[PDB]
Amino acid sequence: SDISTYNGSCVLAMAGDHCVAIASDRRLGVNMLTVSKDFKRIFQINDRIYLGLAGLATDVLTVREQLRFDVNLLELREERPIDPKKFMNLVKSTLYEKRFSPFFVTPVIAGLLPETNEPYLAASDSIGAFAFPKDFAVAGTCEESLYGICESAWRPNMNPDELFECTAKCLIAAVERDSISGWGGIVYIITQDKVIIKEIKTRMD
Amino acid sequence: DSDFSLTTFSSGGKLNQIESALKAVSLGGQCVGVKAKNGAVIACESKPSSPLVEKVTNLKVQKINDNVGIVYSGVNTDFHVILKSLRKASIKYSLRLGVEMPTREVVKHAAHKMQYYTQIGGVRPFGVSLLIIGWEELGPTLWQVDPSGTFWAWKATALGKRSDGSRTFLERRYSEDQSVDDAIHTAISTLKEGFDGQLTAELIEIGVVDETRKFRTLSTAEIRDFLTE
Amino acid sequence: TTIAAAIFDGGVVLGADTRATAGPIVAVKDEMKLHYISDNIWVCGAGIAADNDNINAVISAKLRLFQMNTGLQPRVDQCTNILASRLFQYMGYIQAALIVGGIDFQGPQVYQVAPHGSFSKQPFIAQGSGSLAAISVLENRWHNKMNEHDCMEMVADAIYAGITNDLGSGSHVNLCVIKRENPEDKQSKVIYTFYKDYRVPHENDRNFRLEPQINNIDVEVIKTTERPLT
Amino acid sequence: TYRYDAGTTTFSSDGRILQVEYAIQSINQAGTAIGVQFTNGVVLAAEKKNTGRLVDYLFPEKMAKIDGHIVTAVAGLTADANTLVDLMRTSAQKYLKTYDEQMPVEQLVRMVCDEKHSYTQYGGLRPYGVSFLIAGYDRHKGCQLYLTDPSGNFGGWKATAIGENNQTAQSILKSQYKDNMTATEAMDLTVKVLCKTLSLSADKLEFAVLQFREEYGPKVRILTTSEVDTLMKRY
Amino acid sequence: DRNVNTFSPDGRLLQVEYAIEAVKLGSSAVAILCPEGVIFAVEKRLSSQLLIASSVEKVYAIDDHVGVVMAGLAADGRTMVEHMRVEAQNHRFSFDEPIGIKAVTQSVCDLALAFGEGRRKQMSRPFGTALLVAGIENGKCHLFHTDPSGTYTECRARAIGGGSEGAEALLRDLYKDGMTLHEAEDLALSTLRQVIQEKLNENNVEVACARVSTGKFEIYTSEQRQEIVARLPP
Amino acid sequence: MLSIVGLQGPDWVLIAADSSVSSSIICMSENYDRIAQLDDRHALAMSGETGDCLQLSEYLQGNVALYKFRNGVELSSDALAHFIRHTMAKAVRKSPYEVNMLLSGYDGKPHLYFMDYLGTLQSIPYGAQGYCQYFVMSVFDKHYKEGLTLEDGKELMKLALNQIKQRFTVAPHGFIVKLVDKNGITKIDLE
Amino acid sequence: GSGYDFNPITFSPDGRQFQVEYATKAVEKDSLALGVKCKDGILLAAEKNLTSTLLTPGGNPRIFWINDSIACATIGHRPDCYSIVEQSRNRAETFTSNFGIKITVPQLASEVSQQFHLAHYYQAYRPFGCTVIFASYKDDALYAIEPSGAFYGYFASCFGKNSNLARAELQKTEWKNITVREAVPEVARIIKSLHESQFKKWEIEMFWLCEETNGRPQKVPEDVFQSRFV
Amino acid sequence: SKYDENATTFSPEGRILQVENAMKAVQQGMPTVGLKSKTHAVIAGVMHSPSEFSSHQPKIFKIDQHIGVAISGLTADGRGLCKFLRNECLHHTFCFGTEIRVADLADTVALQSQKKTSKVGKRPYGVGLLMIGAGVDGPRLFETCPSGQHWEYNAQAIGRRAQAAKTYLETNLNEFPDCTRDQLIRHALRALNDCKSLEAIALGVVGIDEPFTILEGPELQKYID
Amino acid sequence: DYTRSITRFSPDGRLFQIDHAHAAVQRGTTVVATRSKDMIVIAVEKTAVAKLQDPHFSKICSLDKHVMCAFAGLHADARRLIQSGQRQCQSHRLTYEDPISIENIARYIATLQLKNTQSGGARPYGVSTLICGFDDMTSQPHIYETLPSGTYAEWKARTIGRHDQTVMEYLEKHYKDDMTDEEAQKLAIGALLEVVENGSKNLEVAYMKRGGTMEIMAEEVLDALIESTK
Numbered sequence A: 001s002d003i004s005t006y007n008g009s010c011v012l013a014m015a016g017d018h019c020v021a022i023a024s025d026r027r028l029g030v031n032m033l034t035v036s037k038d039f040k041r042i043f044q045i046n047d048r049i050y051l052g053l054a055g056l057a058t059d060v061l062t063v064r065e066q067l068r069f070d071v072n073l074l075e076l077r078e079e080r081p082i083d084p085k086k087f088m089n090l091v092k093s094t095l096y097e098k099r100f101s102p103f104f105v106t107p108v109i110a111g112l113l114p115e116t117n118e119p120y121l122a123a124s125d126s127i128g129a130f131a132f133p134k135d136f137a138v139a140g141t142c143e144e145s146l147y148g149i150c151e152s153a154w155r156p157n158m159n160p161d162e163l164f165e166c167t168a169k170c171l172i173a174a175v176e177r178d179s180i181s182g183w184g185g186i187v188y189i190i191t192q193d194k195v196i197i198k199e200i201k202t203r204m205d
Numbered sequence B: 001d002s003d004f005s006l007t008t009f010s011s012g013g014k015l016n017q018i019e020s021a022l023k024a025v026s027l028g029g030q031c032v033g034v035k036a037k038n039g040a041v042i043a044c045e046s047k048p049s050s051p052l053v054e055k056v057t058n059l060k061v062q063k064i065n066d067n068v069g070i071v072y073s074g075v076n077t078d079f080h081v082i083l084k085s086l087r088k089a090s091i092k093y094s095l096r097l098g099v100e101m102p103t104r105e106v107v108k109h110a111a112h113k114m115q116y117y118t119q120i121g122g123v124r125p126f127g128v129s130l131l132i133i134g135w136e137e138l139g140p141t142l143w144q145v146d147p148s149g150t151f152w153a154w155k156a157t158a159l160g161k162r163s164d165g166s167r168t169f170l171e172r173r174y175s176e177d178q179s180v181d182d183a184i185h186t187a188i189s190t191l192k193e194g195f196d197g198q199l200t201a202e203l204i205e206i207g208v209v210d211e212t213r214k215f216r217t218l219s220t221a222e223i224r225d226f227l228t229e
Numbered sequence C: 001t002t003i004a005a006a007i008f009d010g011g012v013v014l015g016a017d018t019r020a021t022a023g024p025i026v027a028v029k030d031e032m033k034l035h036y037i038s039d040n041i042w043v044c045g046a047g048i049a050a051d052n053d054n055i056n057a058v059i060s061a062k063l064r065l066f067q068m069n070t071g072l073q074p075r076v077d078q079c080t081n082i083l084a085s086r087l088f089q090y091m092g093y094i095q096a097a098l099i100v101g102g103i104d105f106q107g108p109q110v111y112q113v114a115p116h117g118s119f120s121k122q123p124f125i126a127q128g129s130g131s132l133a134a135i136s137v138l139e140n141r142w143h144n145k146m147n148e149h150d151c152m153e154m155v156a157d158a159i160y161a162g163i164t165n166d167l168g169s170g171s172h173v174n175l176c177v178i179k180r181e182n183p184e185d186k187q188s189k190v191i192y193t194f195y196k197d198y199r200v201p202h203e204n205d206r207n208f209r210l211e212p213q214i215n216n217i218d219v220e221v222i223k224t225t226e227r228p229l230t
Numbered sequence D: 001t002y003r004y005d006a007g008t009t010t011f012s013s014d015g016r017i018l019q020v021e022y023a024i025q026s027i028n029q030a031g032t033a034i035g036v037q038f039t040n041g042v043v044l045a046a047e048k049k050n051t052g053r054l055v056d057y058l059f060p061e062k063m064a065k066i067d068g069h070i071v072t073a074v075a076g077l078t079a080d081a082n083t084l085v086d087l088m089r090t091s092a093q094k095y096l097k098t099y100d101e102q103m104p105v106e107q108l109v110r111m112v113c114d115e116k117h118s119y120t121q122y123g124g125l126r127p128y129g130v131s132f133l134i135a136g137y138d139r140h141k142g143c144q145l146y147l148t149d150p151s152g153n154f155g156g157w158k159a160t161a162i163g164e165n166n167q168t169a170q171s172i173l174k175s176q177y178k179d180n181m182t183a184t185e186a187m188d189l190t191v192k193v194l195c196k197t198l199s200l201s202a203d204k205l206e207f208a209v210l211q212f213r214e215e216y217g218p219k220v221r222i223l224t225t226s227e228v229d230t231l232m233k234r235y
Numbered sequence E: 001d002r003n004v005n006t007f008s009p010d011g012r013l014l015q016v017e018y019a020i021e022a023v024k025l026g027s028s029a030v031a032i033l034c035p036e037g038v039i040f041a042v043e044k045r046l047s048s049q050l051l052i053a054s055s056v057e058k059v060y061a062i063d064d065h066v067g068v069v070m071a072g073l074a075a076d077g078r079t080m081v082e083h084m085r086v087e088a089q090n091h092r093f094s095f096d097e098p099i100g101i102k103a104v105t106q107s108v109c110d111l112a113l114a115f116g117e118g119r120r121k122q123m124s125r126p127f128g129t130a131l132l133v134a135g136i137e138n139g140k141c142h143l144f145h146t147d148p149s150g151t152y153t154e155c156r157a158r159a160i161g162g163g164s165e166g167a168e169a170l171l172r173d174l175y176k177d178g179m180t181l182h183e184a185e186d187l188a189l190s191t192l193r194q195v196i197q198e199k200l201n202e203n204n205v206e207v208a209c210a211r212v213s214t215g216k217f218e219i220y221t222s223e224q225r226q227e228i229v230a231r232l233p234p
Numbered sequence F: 001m002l003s004i005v006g007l008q009g010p011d012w013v014l015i016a017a018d019s020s021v022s023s024s025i026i027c028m029s030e031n032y033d034r035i036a037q038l039d040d041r042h043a044l045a046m047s048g049e050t051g052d053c054l055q056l057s058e059y060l061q062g063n064v065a066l067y068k069f070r071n072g073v074e075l076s077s078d079a080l081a082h083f084i085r086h087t088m089a090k091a092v093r094k095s096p097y098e099v100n101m102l103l104s105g106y107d108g109k110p111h112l113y114f115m116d117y118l119g120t121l122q123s124i125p126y127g128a129q130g131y132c133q134y135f136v137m138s139v140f141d142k143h144y145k146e147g148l149t150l151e152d153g154k155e156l157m158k159l160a161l162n163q164i165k166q167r168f169t170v171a172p173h174g175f176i177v178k179l180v181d182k183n184g185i186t187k188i189d190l191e
Numbered sequence G: 001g002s003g004y005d006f007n008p009i010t011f012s013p014d015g016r017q018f019q020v021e022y023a024t025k026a027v028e029k030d031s032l033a034l035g036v037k038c039k040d041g042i043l044l045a046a047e048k049n050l051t052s053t054l055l056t057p058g059g060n061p062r063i064f065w066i067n068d069s070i071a072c073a074t075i076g077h078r079p080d081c082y083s084i085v086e087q088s089r090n091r092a093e094t095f096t097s098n099f100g101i102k103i104t105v106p107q108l109a110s111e112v113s114q115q116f117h118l119a120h121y122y123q124a125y126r127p128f129g130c131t132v133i134f135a136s137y138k139d140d141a142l143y144a145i146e147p148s149g150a151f152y153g154y155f156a157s158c159f160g161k162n163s164n165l166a167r168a169e170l171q172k173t174e175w176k177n178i179t180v181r182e183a184v185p186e187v188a189r190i191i192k193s194l195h196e197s198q199f200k201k202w203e204i205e206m207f208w209l210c211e212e213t214n215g216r217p218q219k220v221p222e223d224v225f226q227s228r229f230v
Numbered sequence H: 001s002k003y004d005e006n007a008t009t010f011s012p013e014g015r016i017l018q019v020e021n022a023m024k025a026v027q028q029g030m031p032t033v034g035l036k037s038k039t040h041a042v043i044a045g046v047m048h049s050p051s052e053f054s055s056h057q058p059k060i061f062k063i064d065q066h067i068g069v070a071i072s073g074l075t076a077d078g079r080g081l082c083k084f085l086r087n088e089c090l091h092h093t094f095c096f097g098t099e100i101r102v103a104d105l106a107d108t109v110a111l112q113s114q115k116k117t118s119k120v121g122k123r124p125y126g127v128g129l130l131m132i133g134a135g136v137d138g139p140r141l142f143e144t145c146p147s148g149q150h151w152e153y154n155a156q157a158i159g160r161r162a163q164a165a166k167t168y169l170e171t172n173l174n175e176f177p178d179c180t181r182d183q184l185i186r187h188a189l190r191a192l193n194d195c196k197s198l199e200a201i202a203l204g205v206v207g208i209d210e211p212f213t214i215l216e217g218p219e220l221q222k223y224i225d
Numbered sequence I: 001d002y003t004r005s006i007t008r009f010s011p012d013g014r015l016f017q018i019d020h021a022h023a024a025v026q027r028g029t030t031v032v033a034t035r036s037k038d039m040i041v042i043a044v045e046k047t048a049v050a051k052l053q054d055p056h057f058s059k060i061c062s063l064d065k066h067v068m069c070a071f072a073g074l075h076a077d078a079r080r081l082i083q084s085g086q087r088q089c090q091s092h093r094l095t096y097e098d099p100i101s102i103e104n105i106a107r108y109i110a111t112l113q114l115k116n117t118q119s120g121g122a123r124p125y126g127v128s129t130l131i132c133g134f135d136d137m138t139s140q141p142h143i144y145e146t147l148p149s150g151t152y153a154e155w156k157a158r159t160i161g162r163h164d165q166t167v168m169e170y171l172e173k174h175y176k177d178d179m180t181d182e183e184a185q186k187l188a189i190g191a192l193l194e195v196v197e198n199g200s201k202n203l204e205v206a207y208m209k210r211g212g213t214m215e216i217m218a219e220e221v222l223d224a225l226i227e228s229t230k
């Protein structure tokens, strides 16, 4: 049918009280067939930046490696970690350089601002049309489901526990309505001090 | 076919073309740079060809981006080419990353371009040394970029005409605790030391990065205000 | 999308809705469709959000490099020519239906640039899906040498018309008023005032929300690990 | 034409590229750079070329990071060093993109030496007048220290030196270098060798300490000015 | 001067003349044409007995019918014979026939003088090798001589290498148009032995015949070389 | 649509592939070795057009040998897997290799990677390319136990291949199974 | 004297382009060719000092067609002369391809002087040791390009050996007052007066572009003026 | 001498010394003679035999059906020019379907040689061509020079000992226009004989209706008398 | 690109650049490649600071599982030769599926050196290479010596680098027509020791057995063979 639908993906990011939460389904599916339940769609890009690539597994790995190439080169040439906004623009540049042969992945950058520690969500389409939702950034084949659940469920100023609570529950609700998405979830709660990587249980069907 | 390198190591390991470009810098007009606590300054004795020259049309102190600024000593046209390249690199950095190219990134790009021209064939090294000021995370920064493409980082330095005397003057009359106004005064005094006759605000261009971390060229009124004191 | 720029006596008023849709779903409710090009030029764009954002950033970089090297204020017809040439060389594949709105020595100028590279100087322009709902207001309320406030209200009402009548448009009306800092001085500095959320339609806001959020999904955590942020 | 060509990619009557020999001489005129391998890491040290009361020692000049597992000290033209460091960083990240693995140190050294050799064999361009002490770690060969030349020749060294008084530093290392040393022991050895060969102001020196730990992995840290001063004051 | 493609005030390409000198520094080789076949006799210079003689083969079979012997730089001759082999197989592919001896000779000669310097990206210097191209075309053996200048001449008898001039002088009164292939082999080996500085032996010589009866360019084995050296008057 | 099935064990990998090569409706050969031994440690089962699979296998094997010879170190299984992934990612966008692979390698640890023509790389305990996955994944899910012995592994792979034979309409006339362990890639028969 | 005479792009410390000066010497060595603008047309006359009596009578042209309206007298290095003739033909053809009309001698001279200048402006080229006099009645133009690339329109141009005396003699006549048919005897007399005795056999290769030729280049017919002399 | 560096360098006298060296390289070739009658054109030349038992190197070449060239100088450069001329004839017989004029071939070869002499890194062709053609332009003879120029002749001699042939041609110049094919060939062979230091002389003869043909050795015996 | 024809002929007929590349080779470490009926052995002497550097940088390389390769000369030109040879072995496998013939790969390396002698702007490889190995298509071990000139010759036992003439004399004296594998090892080791005053700590010996890969001799077996030879 569609190339994006080939690898079912469901990436969510939510903004809390000086904390972000990026969750993702753990399924590597090939159209309607589940190949794996240990597929990593969220990648740590920086100490306070995580990138979830919701889309074609091929382009998830290609974009992740290309942005690890760009971020590593930037941090070597600048002796400084990349900012969440700098990395957002980097991802936008990476996707628009292939604008006319686009990567079939929508990135979701969940980061904390380097100094203020404020949440920073930045979700783009296949070609880097980045949005900067102060509440939640969704991507993948569960896009409509995630939008619907997070619009009602997300509330401002969620602490890391509450932020994890909706990230997990809201992602579970999204994946359980997407056939090609689910098979376990992983939620990275990024805070000022620690990153909490909680593997949550979703439906395995 | 001129693709051979005209900058080559001499019998003793001395790039004669690099030394020649450095001499061109040494006869290219004195420009001073002073790093204060809360900013940095780059001034230059931009004495025009004649009183008929319009200063604004060939300002030696120029903007690379909102946060980075550059002065030079040497071949004016080489500086203009490097300045266009640095501004283009900064706007490319903004396109790819949404922020002005960092000060040390601008310095490294200028250094890379100059080294490239010292290695590729059919070209001579750029006969300019660039004093690039801008803010890094730990504070203001002044950077010398030589024709070789080697870039020093300085608290203060002059690298133009009579730059040895001016660098001794800076060694003798520089202190870290200087403010941006103190740094501008130090740069103007250094220019006075290495300039024959009375110095005038018309004849020097000053560009400063301050607490705002934005590079701004001082208008002739501000330069005169500094000179009078 | 509803973008509309008109030229009033003292300058240009550009306006845009803040709704980016990922198909039939409203992806963004605060989308920025007014793109700063130069201090005197702003482009409000419709079509593909990535294409609009990137082309506006690229032309803003080109004109910033121009103003730096040459010391010259970017011209609205210059920006429009660059945009039209770039969109023509991509044969309309960069779906950026742009409305350039600026003030140069020729005065306040509003240009349309179609995704295929067809530009046109027009007093008032509306582009996007709600471009028709907007242009109606623009057709009925624009007149030669109107003051800043009337043009602001007209462009905001045209963006609001697109918002309400068009499904692809919605949320807030962001304005950007390019104007000379001293209107009586034609040589005065061209400044811009961006009115983010100039209109926030109250009938278009979330009017209900469960105060006790009802949820019967329980999270079972397979594995937890905590890692330092440095 | 070619009247003013220097024959950079041409042999001499002795059989050595005179541009590579002049580049080596230029390195010998540059600030001393010393590398010392210890148990699970390599310590690189170097003398800054720009050392004045006014020079602001903001960032490393002779020391550069190539990747999380590779660092390089350089003797010679700092500009050519920056160019080849950019090339090495791009190559290491290219290898990481291709294999999802950190580039083996010997392969990055072979890449920079292929670049430097290509400048000595093709194109009639000036050779890269730089000698790299490429310290790094890879699973294959543990922690390694390689000495590159403008000719494009490299060799693994337990400890070595380049630059001015490189022979004196090599002799001092030979007399003093031990195997399976600790990070502190190797760093003190580098301090001793620099102090004897090289004045001696801490801010004039640069230090980087590659260290492989089974837990953290290969970690490269270029010692800051405060760290270099604290380390040197201990001698 | 100082550039490869420069003409002396005498009207000579200096690099071409120097490549001719390089050929004069190469191992001797005598090509004797007779109606039965063309016979190459080549001095194989063996710096040691450890040198595998078959690997310093100065004779190369360009095709079944045409072969070549080099004099001068063995590597430049390798390039020339590689080009000739590609040309012969291309000709068989394009025209379903063996390439003419003159045709392949002319092709390699055209390749020979295509050296250049000073222009952006070709060989940079003339081939320092002279070839004695010989083979059977239309039931006739043809012997050609190519030198670094790119000129080729059909030859009834020719010599290339260090002894080229002395070999030609010896061939003056020793070569006749009606010799048998037996006599052609004898004359080639005699001339070579005379113009070399070592006693002729089957191991330090390479003999090859473009034979009309077989219509093929074969390279003689050690047994055939012994069969020829035995008959020689010395 | 050729049936390649991989099964990763605690210290081994059983990689099986359809041994029947075909031209149109004709089964040209019944013992075609579709599993490519890129290295002595890595066997790459490939499902796709015989020509595409052969060319990709030869390219990857040549590159692995070239890496082993250029640098005196052999590629890991993760490094080789990501090199294959990079090759496929390059190909898909420009000149695609239409081959879905299972890379089984032992470099001191067993590894099985699910790779496809697009370039999706995933380490898997078991998997398959072709339509056989629709038939074998469940059996693996039903019968795979962590710490599976090599004999139990052969039994499970035999069960999966028997399911391919019995339920897949285009039943491969036979399979070639290879054990990738500390001893290398050894072809085996599952009976 | 000094080493500034080997590289065409090298400037002498006096600003002299020595290679260009040597190209001009090559022009001055050649037998003079001249052109005169007349009422009915333009007459180009080239003195051909036949080195050998075996040279074809009327062959070895020095006047060349460039266009159905443009002729080209050539002086100096004959290889460079015909190289510039063919480059002028190519420039006219490219001009027609780009613009449809036929080129004019002023801008044809500018375009060919571009190549003349590139010869001594970029390295890897030899300055053209030829002066080319482009004549066109339909453009009423007589533009001579020099080896440097300096091109000027002339009322009466002349280059080659004894070019100064030939120009001094051309100065004695108001050529536009007379037609080409009465200009031919005058120019022939000029060249015969300046013709050197050492060259026994020679010819006067006259061409004209006139109304009698309908503006087309044409060698002056033998009946009108027998070009061949002894 | 010091300016004899490149074909791109002008000597202070306006002379390209490398071009003059190539011209001398032509003057060192074997005696070549060309003649032109109102109906036929002839090129003849004593082919060079480097060795006693080597054949005489071919000197006359057939460029097109009614065009041929006799090379004098580096025979390899002559073969390269023959390849170029045959390509030009094949692209004029492709674009227009008729045979090119030998004047146009002379123009093209002169242009190529001049481009060799005008750009650094290239050498002038060390060969001079006596090209005879016949067509709508009539019989025409052109002596193309390394410098990049061709001189049209009714008769001409180049190479070594060519002064005697030139003298003979000058003596019989006015006879050539009316000379028949056989008489023009006889004049060619008797201009070469004055250069004798036949089986060496090769002669290509063309006519307005007669296609260019090469006669060598005994075939020319009938034209000696 | 740059094309300065580094390698040109001299008046005496010598390529001086090839002489200089041979000088570079002759300043390289000695290599000794010897063969038996079934096994080839290469012994390279190593100059190093044993207390301060790793002796793991080997002159002996493996172009393929059947092609062993050693070099004398510039280590960077040799690295380029070895890299190209490995690429060519793998490309021959790609194009033929058969292991590249030892003669084929030796010819390829010699042709690389030759192309550097022929390509403008390319410096001849200052490396002489010993390409050894086994061909199943011939059932013969081969040892070719490719020179900087680009000439390759097979040898029964060949040496390159410094002291190459002394080691050649040793090989000629102590060579047996039908040596056993251990006899080939002894010949190579003794030939290298004839110029080296150090044992296993200096020498580096590798070998390739019939239908086998390259195995580097241990520091225990090498020393035992050294003592046995003495």
Ligand SMILES: *C(=O)[C@]1([C@@H](O)[C@@H]2C=CCCC2)NC(=O)[C@@H]2CCO[C@@]21C
Pocket (backbone or CB within 6 Å): C001, C002, C019, C020, C021, C022, C031, C032, C033, C045, C046, C047, C048, C049, C050, C052, C128, C129, C168, C169
């Ligand atoms: C507007 O045209 C629209 C927006 O996404 C818009 C795109 C350009 C500027 C950023 C936001 N483009 C679209 O694809 C949808 C369809 C309806 O109009 C959109 C909302």
